[PDB]
């Protein structure tokens, strides 16, 4: 129930640069077990509480984990324009989701 997700919002970047995607679960003491980073079509990363960061091989060239629970995109294409999602797997509350819209311009 009680707890929200704040994000970096709707942002914009030049082609070829980097962006940081950050999220922050707040207003709850429930423990974060996993966080997934996803595009509208593909999952990009998973930070596990036990086992750590895995990065989807479709983005190994261009995606560093963090800082913190965020994620850094490296060589943005206009193809990267769209929605992004940090999904918070949590106990006891459940799945919290924050959303970011990115637009890569030329």
């Amino acid at each position, epitope marked *: 129930m009680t707890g929200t997700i704040e994000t970096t919002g709707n942002i914009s970047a030049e082609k070829g640069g980097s962006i940081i995607l950050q999220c922050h679960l707040s207003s709850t003491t429930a423990q974060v077990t996993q966080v997934n980073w996803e595009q509208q*079509d593909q999952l990009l990363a998973i930070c596990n509480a036990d*086992l750590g960061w895995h990065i989807s*091989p479709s983005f190994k060239d261009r995606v560093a984990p963090g800082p913190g629970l965020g994620l850094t995109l490296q060589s943005l294409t206009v193809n990267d324009t769209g929605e992004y999602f940090c999904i918070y797997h949590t106990y006891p509350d459940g799945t919290y989701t924050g959303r970011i819209f990115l637009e890569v311009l030329e």
Partner: antibody
Amino acid sequence: EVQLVESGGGLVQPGGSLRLSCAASGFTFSDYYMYWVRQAPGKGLEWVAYITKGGGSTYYPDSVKGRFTISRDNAKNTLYLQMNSLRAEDTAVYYCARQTNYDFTMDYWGQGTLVTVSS
Amino acid sequence: EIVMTQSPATLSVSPGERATLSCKASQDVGTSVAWYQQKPGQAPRLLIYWASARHTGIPARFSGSGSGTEFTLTISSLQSEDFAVYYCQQYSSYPLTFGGGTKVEIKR
């Protein structure tokens, strides 16, 4: 119980074309990323095709790139492999596989269907 | 591409005993390494993901170790049913690549 059924295997002449089918059940086929993997008789396993949950992105190894085409129809609960310009060394049992939605690999494989490329 | 080499090719093990399998990646694959059991005539069955995490439905006598380039699957008290060819696989990057396998026979 997750179920994957492959279909379409048989003899085809070199240079020809064939099309394979995987029929899913027991899981929301549309949420899951899908693979094809192949295995020559007596030899090992070779990744051949990857596709996104909605079909937007596809990834192939150099071995088959530009000849195989992975695809899905989400309402048919079906994944397809279109094998063009076939070669002799393409002969293998072909498996479709489902990706873990908690990691980036394969949890469940079908039983396979066997392709044979010979004159 | 990332070559995964398993060793040894073959291992005969008395029942109740421990087999130890080895997968060696040609470059750092992190902990993106999975282990698969393929019984003759059967599809591969997933045993370990994330180099150490055991897939549900897998007995705890299977156990996965390693990070970096050196990975290790361990079957701590073999049973007749555990006879299969076991496969390792890295998913750090494309192309996803598999080991050559290690066949394991039951001793009697």
